[PDB]
Amino acid sequence: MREIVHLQAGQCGNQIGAKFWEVISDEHGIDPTGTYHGDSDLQLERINVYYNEATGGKYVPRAVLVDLEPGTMDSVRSGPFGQIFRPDNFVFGQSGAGNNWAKGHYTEGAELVDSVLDVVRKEAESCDCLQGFQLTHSLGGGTGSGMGTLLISKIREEYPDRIMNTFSVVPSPKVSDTVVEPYNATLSVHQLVENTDETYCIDNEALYDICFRTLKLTTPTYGDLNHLVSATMSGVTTCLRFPGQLNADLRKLAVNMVPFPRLHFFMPGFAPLTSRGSQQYRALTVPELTQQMFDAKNMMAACDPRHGRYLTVAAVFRGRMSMKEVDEQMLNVQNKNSSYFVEWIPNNVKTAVCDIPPRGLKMSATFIGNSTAIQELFKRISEQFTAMFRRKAFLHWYTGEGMDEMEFTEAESNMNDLVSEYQQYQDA
Amino acid sequence: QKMKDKKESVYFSNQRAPLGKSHDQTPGLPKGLDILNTTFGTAIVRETS
Amino acid sequence: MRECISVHVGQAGVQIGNACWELYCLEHGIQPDGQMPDDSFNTFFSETGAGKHVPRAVFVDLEPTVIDEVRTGTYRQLFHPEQLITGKEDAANNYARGHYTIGKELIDLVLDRIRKLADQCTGLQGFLIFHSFGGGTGSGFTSLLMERLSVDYGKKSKLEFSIYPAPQVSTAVVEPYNSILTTHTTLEHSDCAFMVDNEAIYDICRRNLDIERPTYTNLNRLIGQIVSSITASLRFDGALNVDLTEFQTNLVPYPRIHFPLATYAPVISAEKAYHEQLSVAEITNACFEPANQMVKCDPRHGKYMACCLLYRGDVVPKDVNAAIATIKTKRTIQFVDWCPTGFKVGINYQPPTVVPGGDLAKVQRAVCMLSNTTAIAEAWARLDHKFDLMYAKRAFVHWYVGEGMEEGEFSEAREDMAALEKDYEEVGMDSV
Amino acid sequence: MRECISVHVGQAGVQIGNACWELYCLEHGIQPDGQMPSFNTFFSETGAGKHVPRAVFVDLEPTVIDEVRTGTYRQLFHPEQLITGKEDAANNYARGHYTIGKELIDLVLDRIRKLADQCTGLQGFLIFHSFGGGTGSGFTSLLMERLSVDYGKKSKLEFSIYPAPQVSTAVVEPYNSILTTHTTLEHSDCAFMVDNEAIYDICRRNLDIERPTYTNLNRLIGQIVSSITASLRFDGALNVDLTEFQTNLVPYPRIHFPLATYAPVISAEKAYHEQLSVAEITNACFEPANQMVKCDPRHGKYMACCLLYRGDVVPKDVNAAIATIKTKRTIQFVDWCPTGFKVGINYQPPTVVPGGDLAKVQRAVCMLSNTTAIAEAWARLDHKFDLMYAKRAFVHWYVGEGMEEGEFSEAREDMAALEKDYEEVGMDSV
Ligand SMILES: Nc1nc2c(ncn2[C@@H]2O[C@H](COP(=O)(O)OP(=O)(O)OP(=O)(O)O)[C@@H](O)[C@H]2O)c(=O)[nH]1
Ligand SMILES: Nc1nc2c(ncn2[C@@H]2O[C@H](COP(=O)(O)OP(=O)(O)OP(=O)(O)O)[C@@H](O)[C@H]2O)c(=O)[nH]1
Ligand SMILES: Nc1nc2c(ncn2[C@@H]2O[C@H](COP(=O)(O)OP(=O)(O)O)[C@@H](O)[C@H]2O)c(=O)[nH]1
Ligand SMILES: [Mg+2]
Ligand SMILES: [Mg+2]
């Protein structure tokens, strides 16, 4: 009764959204046929957060797989846990679209959206206490972060206080996997910052260096980094399905987290991860894990924490702990690190301690920080529009459908409106 | 007679360069033609990790 | 279901198009008679109820000597005999005899076959035409087949791969005439019009290989693989896959620039791949060594605008971006300033596949690179200095006059290539 | 780990290169076709298990490279490294640097790009050459000026063969060994030098070998370069890197020409009866007889002496062996270097190559010495340049292939400065 309605969109979010259901179903004892196999008691009694229940003693997810190109949905139907879903809500079409924002909100995504949202309407109007949404997308293309604004715009027209929980993969600094990426990423910032409340921003570059340094993996493929993102997926949902000593829903993890209505972007992180060689050599505690939470390397989005002050760090703990150790050792990280937190907030941290941790170690953790230092992510992308815009580069596709240059100038300021306010509030 | 002329006598001259065939690669490549010869297996990394 | 329509016009593109369907049926299990002893192959093929498999390509050329070697040849048991359109007498290599006079006859027949195939198709993605520049029926005819599709159909991409006229060698006289006819028409409705040349494949064949005297046969298999490393992202599921319509936007910066180059990286024999180490960090800059390329040109006088490194085979994506930034830190690989880090990747899980009897070795990896470059305008400078010297004396006009060409349209097309020469000198300049 | 790239030029170096890789393989455990039935410094590795060495061979004649593509070692090298021109440099610095050289210098450099773009940490280019003729001296001159410009600061070490005081196989050889100083002065960092005729008398008195070919002289030089690169591949009590050498051996940057000596060079029939302790073969390096260059050490003074010991050696026997040398009076040391020496120890003993004439010995010393007394060896080499260039003899060939006439006399005064830069430091300061 702290519910979440799920969706997938784009190629990048479809995979990690599919690799969401690998992690959550192992926690809860479900078999892909839908038989409860877990021996522990507590896996069942809050299962309706993410799941409907199927008639005949069987279990079934609560999500809608959609994207415009049909290879990916047909790839997951042949996947590991493909046969769990409901076959009426696969809105997949054989047709395609060429990463253009214009057609996907005015012509080619307009035919699709009623069939898209009438099953987000179905699973919600037969619900008890709906509380949030979960849409896995990525910031770049005309299909991922194009359609992220399509599947959020008509929602807030009716839902008054429901808290959306999306997850977005940012453009990396050094490399590129789309030429026309600033020309489509800032196009969604016109609507997402108005409406989203959680976007777990992710760099692809920082995901490799955790694998290179801590994990000592030379070759992190795509079977790795989804399984690294997937921990902070089901790490924030500990006080939504489990008992615990300090409980909070997605709203309390917004009233604490959100200070002003447009600075609401979350940085992931999973503490007790180590390579196989030095795993015996390392002994973990509540003092030891709090290093790996507050380490400079265990952040899935690459920024420099030593170039900004944290607004609200909220690290969720999971397992059996001492809770002086929770509070005395999350002040020692604030006392010793003085100038790198805001002076106009007296206590900058908040814990959350659970009673059953996710599987893999005794004493798991997950650290979520809302810094100020992610303006350097914002500076580069907003620069990459305007210094490429001094020649009027790619407008002859989008102006076939009415994407005038009066739009693309003013949405760049709505990126730089965010830059001006971190500079307004870094020196306060 | 064409086979005898182009096999016995004519083998000495054009042995370096044929028409659409590269060379007599057999004395150089100590392998088999059906074997797989690249840099290395990344399946080694896949099995290790 | 993601399908594609092929046409092959002219003995340049037909004979390479004969050289592609071996490589497509050798990936799968289909024998030449069409019986396969899977929902992937619907890109290029189809199925009839006897277990036979039937392709998606139509073969047409006015001269009948190269289509009739296939019907008599060992590959007739594959196609549709109503697709194979033969003819009477060719176009004199003369534009108004591939377009205006003799070219007109077979058109309503042939355009009712891109109509027939697509009417039983689910959702279509583009075309795979195969022509060449300096022809007279490889230029006049494919002009007319391109102004009838998109005028009638509309909003679908076009993917033909031509052969550039070399700046040194050629096998006609009337080719500086003949080029400026098909680069009028590829400018006004073609959206992805690739190219290679006959000359650079000769000199890959000397250094990377060691095959002196390259025939016609060994050239066409290499041009098959570049296509079959591009077009095999529509039948193979992979980590990073791109639609045909999706690179109709991200490549073309301004309407004019849609002619990039191509490069297959580990072209090698069995006696060097046994020695060489061809892993990911060195077969990705071999596409930027000045040797391995498909125009006899100097790359270092140009800046590579939008490189789309399509990989395939057994690779992992840490090894890509470690090697992507290794290029831009190198000072020799100079880029366009205003565009971003221009690189662009794509990974699949299907190896190179060797058609037997060739000189190509078994490698576990392959890179196809599509590189828009500044360095092609110099080759476009030479092909009008090859043109105007005729037109100072007005040589050979009277045959084109004899079939329907005016005098003045040879200057209309040259100022239209003054328009394409001036664009690389107004977008290659620095924006300040 | 740490890597080194080897390039051999000319008739001298390529013949030297086949002698060292006959013994570099036998240090390790690989068959000569590159197969095996810590050494990552010199061999890259395909997944199949072929040991490809790091080498770019070059010559302007096919007649010395074609016995590598057809010899036993054809399976070892990658056949895109054996660089081969069309016609020789005709023993001309004019042809080997100006006319014939600039058709291959794109390919030779862009191969060196392709061996250095996969090594982890690169520190030394074992370039091999000679001061005899055209390609050995002149192509190395263009080869240096393209490496250091395009690579920067990675330290090179060259090995050379010097013209003898009397005994040589050329006429115009002073015209190529004065003009080659304009490329081993500036860009190359050290140049380890042995002249040919001094090896010959060592091959007559110590080894009782009459009529030695160019194989036995190439085996002996094989056991010096392998002694330099022991500390790269086999861990020891005191290892010495390549960057260790150049700041421990060169006083002033126009003086990099150290000599070489090998101590236990004795035959198999007399090795049994003599034990070779390190108190007696330390003396055997400093003999005027056993020196592998004919410049008399007791004419002048010693500058700085580097030692390299291989095998069953204990360190305080070495320090007892060092201090007994400074206390003598005939071994004259330079006045302002009280330190005098530099040492090195490694555990793997020297390994005899089959068909070799050296004996299997548990101890060995490599020796390096800047001397003040090789200044006479430049005194008779500028004279043999002075004798012919009085009447402009033989210059009409080099001039017509792209040289000016003043370029020859520009090099003689530059060699007049180097003899004075090497004699002004010889006086004891006061
Ligand atoms: N790659 C390849 N190119 C070819 C082949 N045969 C001819 N060509 C090229 O085709 C060019 C001539 O232009 P084409 O377009 O083929 O002439 P055409 O318009 O087709 O007219 P036809 O004579 O009927 O074939 C020559 O310069 C050749 O380089 C071939 O078998 N393979
Ligand atoms: N130590 C040693 N010196 C050699 C050997 N062979 C030749 N030399 C020297 O090489 C000098 C002649 O120069 P080379 O390098 O052999 O000939 P070149 O200038 O390269 O001319 P080409 O070989 O025809 O290209 C002579 O003075 C010899 O002293 C050898 O096997 N060992
Ligand atoms: N982690 C992960 N990232 C992916 C995957 N597929 C694509 N991406 C990322 O998606 C980015 C490109 O933007 P994209 O999501 O494709 O835009 P879209 O075409 O609308 O989906 C690239 O930088 C990739 O890193 C995947 O399977 N796993
Ligand atoms: Mg023809
Ligand atoms: Mg020589």
mmCIF file of N, CA and C in Angstrom, chain A residues 11 68-71 74-75 94-100 143 173-180 208 212 217-222 384 387-388 390-394 396-397 401, chain C residues 1-2 122-123 237-241 243 245-246 248-255 306 316-319 321 324-325 338-345 426-427 429-432:
data_model
loop_
_atom_site.group_PDB
_atom_site.id
_atom_site.type_symbol
_atom_site.label_atom_id
_atom_site.label_comp_id
_atom_site.label_asym_id
_atom_site.label_seq_id
_atom_site.Cartn_x
_atom_site.Cartn_y
_atom_site.Cartn_z
ATOM 1 N N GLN A 11 15.782 1.605 -25.666
ATOM 2 C CA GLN A 11 16.523 0.352 -25.595
ATOM 3 C C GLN A 11 17.309 0.226 -24.300
ATOM 4 N N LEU A 68 8.984 1.402 -29.512
ATOM 5 C CA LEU A 68 8.468 1.452 -30.871
ATOM 6 C C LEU A 68 9.050 0.362 -31.762
ATOM 7 N N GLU A 69 10.338 0.016 -31.587
ATOM 8 C CA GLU A 69 10.967 -1.000 -32.439
ATOM 9 C C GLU A 69 10.905 -2.377 -31.785
ATOM 10 N N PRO A 70 10.517 -3.424 -32.516
ATOM 11 C CA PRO A 70 10.043 -4.650 -31.873
ATOM 12 C C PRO A 70 11.108 -5.679 -31.574
ATOM 13 N N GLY A 71 12.382 -5.406 -31.854
ATOM 14 C CA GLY A 71 13.409 -6.402 -31.592
ATOM 15 C C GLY A 71 13.606 -6.667 -30.110
ATOM 16 N N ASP A 74 10.695 -8.580 -28.328
ATOM 17 C CA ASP A 74 10.824 -9.953 -28.776
ATOM 18 C C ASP A 74 12.113 -10.594 -28.275
ATOM 19 N N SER A 75 13.105 -9.793 -27.877
ATOM 20 C CA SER A 75 14.313 -10.357 -27.290
ATOM 21 C C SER A 75 14.099 -10.796 -25.850
ATOM 22 N N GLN A 94 5.922 -3.462 -35.370
ATOM 23 C CA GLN A 94 6.998 -3.804 -36.292
ATOM 24 C C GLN A 94 7.682 -2.562 -36.850
ATOM 25 N N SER A 95 6.992 -1.425 -36.835
ATOM 26 C CA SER A 95 7.484 -0.185 -37.412
ATOM 27 C C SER A 95 8.612 0.416 -36.577
ATOM 28 N N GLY A 96 9.234 1.460 -37.127
ATOM 29 C CA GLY A 96 10.362 2.105 -36.492
ATOM 30 C C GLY A 96 10.257 3.618 -36.547
ATOM 31 N N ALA A 97 11.261 4.259 -35.950
ATOM 32 C CA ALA A 97 11.399 5.709 -35.942
ATOM 33 C C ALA A 97 12.870 6.049 -35.752
ATOM 34 N N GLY A 98 13.304 7.113 -36.422
ATOM 35 C CA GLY A 98 14.715 7.423 -36.513
ATOM 36 C C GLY A 98 15.267 8.404 -35.504
ATOM 37 N N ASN A 99 14.955 8.197 -34.220
ATOM 38 C CA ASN A 99 15.448 9.010 -33.102
ATOM 39 C C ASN A 99 15.125 10.493 -33.267
ATOM 40 N N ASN A 100 13.923 10.782 -33.753
ATOM 41 C CA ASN A 100 13.442 12.144 -33.935
ATOM 42 C C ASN A 100 12.364 12.437 -32.900
ATOM 43 N N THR A 143 14.018 8.039 -28.829
ATOM 44 C CA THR A 143 13.061 7.046 -28.358
ATOM 45 C C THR A 143 13.088 6.866 -26.852
ATOM 46 N N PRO A 173 31.136 12.055 -20.430
ATOM 47 C CA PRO A 173 31.964 13.145 -20.967
ATOM 48 C C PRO A 173 32.767 12.787 -22.207
ATOM 49 N N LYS A 174 33.577 11.730 -22.133
ATOM 50 C CA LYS A 174 34.646 11.552 -23.109
ATOM 51 C C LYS A 174 34.171 10.988 -24.441
ATOM 52 N N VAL A 175 33.158 10.126 -24.440
ATOM 53 C CA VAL A 175 32.752 9.399 -25.634
ATOM 54 C C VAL A 175 31.316 9.767 -25.977
ATOM 55 N N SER A 176 30.843 9.240 -27.101
ATOM 56 C CA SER A 176 29.473 9.483 -27.520
ATOM 57 C C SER A 176 28.952 8.261 -28.251
ATOM 58 N N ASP A 177 27.661 7.967 -28.062
ATOM 59 C CA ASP A 177 26.967 6.913 -28.797
ATOM 60 C C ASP A 177 25.746 7.445 -29.539
ATOM 61 N N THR A 178 25.703 8.753 -29.799
ATOM 62 C CA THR A 178 24.753 9.413 -30.689
ATOM 63 C C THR A 178 25.328 10.788 -30.990
ATOM 64 N N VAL A 179 25.319 11.177 -32.265
ATOM 65 C CA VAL A 179 25.795 12.508 -32.636
ATOM 66 C C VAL A 179 24.819 13.606 -32.182
ATOM 67 N N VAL A 180 23.519 13.305 -32.159
ATOM 68 C CA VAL A 180 22.453 14.299 -32.078
ATOM 69 C C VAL A 180 21.914 14.227 -30.644
ATOM 70 N N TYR A 208 32.366 1.658 -15.512
ATOM 71 C CA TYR A 208 33.512 0.839 -15.890
ATOM 72 C C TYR A 208 34.629 0.901 -14.853
ATOM 73 N N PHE A 212 36.903 -1.664 -12.979
ATOM 74 C CA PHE A 212 38.341 -1.773 -13.189
ATOM 75 C C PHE A 212 39.121 -1.744 -11.881
ATOM 76 N N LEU A 217 37.713 -6.134 -12.480
ATOM 77 C CA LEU A 217 37.239 -6.725 -13.717
ATOM 78 C C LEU A 217 37.891 -5.988 -14.874
ATOM 79 N N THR A 218 38.615 -6.719 -15.719
ATOM 80 C CA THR A 218 39.143 -6.102 -16.929
ATOM 81 C C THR A 218 38.035 -5.834 -17.939
ATOM 82 N N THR A 219 37.060 -6.741 -18.038
ATOM 83 C CA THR A 219 36.042 -6.718 -19.088
ATOM 84 C C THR A 219 34.636 -6.662 -18.498
ATOM 85 N N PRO A 220 34.141 -5.474 -18.128
ATOM 86 C CA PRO A 220 32.713 -5.358 -17.801
ATOM 87 C C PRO A 220 31.802 -5.232 -19.012
ATOM 88 N N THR A 221 31.112 -6.319 -19.328
ATOM 89 C CA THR A 221 30.140 -6.345 -20.411
ATOM 90 C C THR A 221 28.811 -5.763 -19.930
ATOM 91 N N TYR A 222 27.757 -5.909 -20.735
ATOM 92 C CA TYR A 222 26.457 -5.399 -20.333
ATOM 93 C C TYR A 222 25.712 -6.332 -19.397
ATOM 94 N N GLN A 384 27.313 22.017 -24.982
ATOM 95 C CA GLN A 384 27.329 21.254 -26.227
ATOM 96 C C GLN A 384 26.131 21.543 -27.108
ATOM 97 N N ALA A 387 27.352 25.867 -28.398
ATOM 98 C CA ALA A 387 28.523 26.004 -29.255
ATOM 99 C C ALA A 387 28.436 25.135 -30.500
ATOM 100 N N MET A 388 27.501 24.188 -30.537
ATOM 101 C CA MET A 388 27.110 23.539 -31.776
ATOM 102 C C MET A 388 25.936 24.224 -32.448
ATOM 103 N N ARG A 390 25.687 27.521 -33.109
ATOM 104 C CA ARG A 390 26.120 28.690 -33.863
ATOM 105 C C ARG A 390 26.209 28.443 -35.373
ATOM 106 N N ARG A 391 25.675 27.323 -35.880
ATOM 107 C CA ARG A 391 25.614 27.056 -37.305
ATOM 108 C C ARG A 391 24.289 26.473 -37.783
ATOM 109 N N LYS A 392 23.299 26.282 -36.895
ATOM 110 C CA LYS A 392 21.950 25.772 -37.206
ATOM 111 C C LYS A 392 21.999 24.386 -37.858
ATOM 112 N N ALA A 393 22.423 23.412 -37.060
ATOM 113 C CA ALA A 393 22.944 22.176 -37.626
ATOM 114 C C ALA A 393 21.886 21.204 -38.160
ATOM 115 N N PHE A 394 20.988 20.668 -37.325
ATOM 116 C CA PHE A 394 20.191 19.504 -37.727
ATOM 117 C C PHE A 394 18.688 19.774 -37.776
ATOM 118 N N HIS A 396 16.556 20.349 -40.173
ATOM 119 C CA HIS A 396 15.746 20.047 -41.345
ATOM 120 C C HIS A 396 15.018 18.709 -41.265
ATOM 121 N N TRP A 397 15.181 17.948 -40.179
ATOM 122 C CA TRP A 397 14.299 16.809 -39.936
ATOM 123 C C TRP A 397 13.112 17.221 -39.073
ATOM 124 N N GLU A 401 7.769 18.541 -38.896
ATOM 125 C CA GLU A 401 6.627 18.363 -38.015
ATOM 126 C C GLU A 401 6.359 19.554 -37.105
ATOM 127 N N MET C 1 9.434 -7.905 -37.546
ATOM 128 C CA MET C 1 9.760 -8.226 -38.926
ATOM 129 C C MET C 1 10.309 -6.981 -39.608
ATOM 130 N N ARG C 2 11.599 -7.008 -39.926
ATOM 131 C CA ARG C 2 12.331 -5.821 -40.360
ATOM 132 C C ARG C 2 13.009 -6.142 -41.688
ATOM 133 N N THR C 122 5.419 -6.284 -44.023
ATOM 134 C CA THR C 122 4.779 -5.867 -42.777
ATOM 135 C C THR C 122 5.097 -4.415 -42.428
ATOM 136 N N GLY C 123 6.368 -4.118 -42.176
ATOM 137 C CA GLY C 123 6.802 -2.750 -41.986
ATOM 138 C C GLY C 123 8.203 -2.585 -42.528
ATOM 139 N N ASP C 237 20.347 -10.179 -33.269
ATOM 140 C CA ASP C 237 20.135 -9.411 -32.051
ATOM 141 C C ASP C 237 21.463 -9.137 -31.365
ATOM 142 N N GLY C 238 21.634 -7.910 -30.902
ATOM 143 C CA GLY C 238 22.927 -7.465 -30.443
ATOM 144 C C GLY C 238 22.803 -6.478 -29.307
ATOM 145 N N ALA C 239 23.961 -6.052 -28.800
ATOM 146 C CA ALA C 239 23.972 -5.163 -27.647
ATOM 147 C C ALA C 239 23.565 -3.749 -28.026
ATOM 148 N N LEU C 240 24.006 -3.267 -29.186
ATOM 149 C CA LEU C 240 23.764 -1.888 -29.622
ATOM 150 C C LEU C 240 23.389 -1.911 -31.100
ATOM 151 N N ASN C 241 22.095 -1.812 -31.393
ATOM 152 C CA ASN C 241 21.593 -2.023 -32.742
ATOM 153 C C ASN C 241 20.845 -0.801 -33.242
ATOM 154 N N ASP C 243 18.545 1.107 -36.426
ATOM 155 C CA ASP C 243 17.648 0.944 -37.562
ATOM 156 C C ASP C 243 18.249 1.624 -38.789
ATOM 157 N N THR C 245 16.505 3.646 -40.664
ATOM 158 C CA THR C 245 15.991 5.007 -40.576
ATOM 159 C C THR C 245 16.732 5.808 -39.508
ATOM 160 N N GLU C 246 17.324 5.127 -38.527
ATOM 161 C CA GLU C 246 17.959 5.816 -37.411
ATOM 162 C C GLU C 246 19.269 6.480 -37.815
ATOM 163 N N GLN C 248 19.606 7.703 -40.857
ATOM 164 C CA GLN C 248 19.268 8.707 -41.857
ATOM 165 C C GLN C 248 19.250 10.110 -41.258
ATOM 166 N N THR C 249 19.280 10.222 -39.931
ATOM 167 C CA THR C 249 19.370 11.503 -39.243
ATOM 168 C C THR C 249 20.743 11.770 -38.637
ATOM 169 N N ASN C 250 21.318 10.811 -37.900
ATOM 170 C CA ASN C 250 22.528 11.129 -37.144
ATOM 171 C C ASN C 250 23.778 11.245 -38.015
ATOM 172 N N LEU C 251 23.803 10.626 -39.201
ATOM 173 C CA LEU C 251 24.915 10.859 -40.120
ATOM 174 C C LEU C 251 24.819 12.225 -40.780
ATOM 175 N N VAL C 252 23.803 12.423 -41.618
ATOM 176 C CA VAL C 252 23.674 13.670 -42.408
ATOM 177 C C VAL C 252 23.590 15.010 -41.665
ATOM 178 N N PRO C 253 24.719 15.724 -41.542
ATOM 179 C CA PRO C 253 24.736 16.994 -40.809
ATOM 180 C C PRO C 253 23.916 18.090 -41.444
ATOM 181 N N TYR C 254 24.018 18.241 -42.749
ATOM 182 C CA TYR C 254 23.301 19.278 -43.466
ATOM 183 C C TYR C 254 22.777 18.464 -44.606
ATOM 184 N N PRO C 255 21.806 18.980 -45.360
ATOM 185 C CA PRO C 255 21.240 18.086 -46.374
ATOM 186 C C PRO C 255 22.276 17.530 -47.348
ATOM 187 N N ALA C 306 31.902 12.353 -38.788
ATOM 188 C CA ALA C 306 30.979 11.520 -38.009
ATOM 189 C C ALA C 306 31.286 10.048 -38.274
ATOM 190 N N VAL C 316 33.771 -6.934 -26.093
ATOM 191 C CA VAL C 316 33.125 -6.430 -24.874
ATOM 192 C C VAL C 316 33.274 -4.910 -24.830
ATOM 193 N N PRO C 317 32.339 -4.167 -24.227
ATOM 194 C CA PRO C 317 32.296 -2.708 -24.422
ATOM 195 C C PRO C 317 33.183 -1.869 -23.507
ATOM 196 N N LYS C 318 33.925 -2.452 -22.572
ATOM 197 C CA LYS C 318 35.004 -1.695 -21.950
ATOM 198 C C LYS C 318 36.103 -1.430 -22.957
ATOM 199 N N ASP C 319 36.391 -2.420 -23.795
ATOM 200 C CA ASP C 319 37.491 -2.341 -24.736
ATOM 201 C C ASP C 319 37.212 -1.386 -25.886
ATOM 202 N N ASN C 321 35.402 1.945 -25.486
ATOM 203 C CA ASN C 321 35.594 3.329 -25.043
ATOM 204 C C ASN C 321 36.967 3.573 -24.442
ATOM 205 N N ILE C 324 38.237 4.281 -27.921
ATOM 206 C CA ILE C 324 37.660 5.467 -28.561
ATOM 207 C C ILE C 324 38.430 6.726 -28.176
ATOM 208 N N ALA C 325 38.661 6.924 -26.880
ATOM 209 C CA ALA C 325 39.378 8.108 -26.428
ATOM 210 C C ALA C 325 40.867 8.028 -26.724
ATOM 211 N N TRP C 338 33.652 22.067 -34.211
ATOM 212 C CA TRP C 338 32.351 22.421 -33.661
ATOM 213 C C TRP C 338 31.491 21.195 -33.354
ATOM 214 N N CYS C 339 31.634 20.105 -34.104
ATOM 215 C CA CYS C 339 30.911 18.865 -33.821
ATOM 216 C C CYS C 339 31.501 18.176 -32.579
ATOM 217 N N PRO C 340 30.737 17.228 -31.903
ATOM 218 C CA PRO C 340 31.228 16.669 -30.631
ATOM 219 C C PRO C 340 32.363 15.682 -30.802
ATOM 220 N N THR C 341 32.643 14.936 -29.735
ATOM 221 C CA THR C 341 33.348 13.682 -29.923
ATOM 222 C C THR C 341 32.464 12.872 -30.851
ATOM 223 N N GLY C 342 32.865 12.759 -32.116
ATOM 224 C CA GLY C 342 31.932 12.361 -33.156
ATOM 225 C C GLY C 342 31.664 10.886 -33.247
ATOM 226 N N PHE C 343 32.405 10.095 -32.483
ATOM 227 C CA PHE C 343 32.409 8.653 -32.597
ATOM 228 C C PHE C 343 31.059 8.075 -32.205
ATOM 229 N N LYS C 344 30.828 6.842 -32.642
ATOM 230 C CA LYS C 344 29.532 6.187 -32.522
ATOM 231 C C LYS C 344 29.747 4.696 -32.730
ATOM 232 N N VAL C 345 29.229 3.882 -31.814
ATOM 233 C CA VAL C 345 29.568 2.471 -31.765
ATOM 234 C C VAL C 345 28.334 1.638 -32.073
ATOM 235 N N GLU C 426 32.300 26.037 -46.879
ATOM 236 C CA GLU C 426 31.533 26.875 -45.966
ATOM 237 C C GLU C 426 31.009 26.134 -44.742
ATOM 238 N N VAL C 427 31.156 24.812 -44.663
ATOM 239 C CA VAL C 427 30.934 24.103 -43.408
ATOM 240 C C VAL C 427 32.216 23.550 -42.826
ATOM 241 N N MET C 429 34.910 25.416 -42.580
ATOM 242 C CA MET C 429 35.511 26.541 -41.891
ATOM 243 C C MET C 429 35.097 26.535 -40.426
ATOM 244 N N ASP C 430 35.896 27.203 -39.604
ATOM 245 C CA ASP C 430 35.643 27.228 -38.174
ATOM 246 C C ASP C 430 34.574 28.257 -37.835
ATOM 247 N N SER C 431 33.677 27.878 -36.931
ATOM 248 C CA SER C 431 32.542 28.705 -36.552
ATOM 249 C C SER C 431 32.957 29.631 -35.417
ATOM 250 N N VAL C 432 33.103 30.915 -35.723
ATOM 251 C CA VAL C 432 33.445 31.905 -34.713
ATOM 252 C C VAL C 432 32.846 33.256 -35.092
#
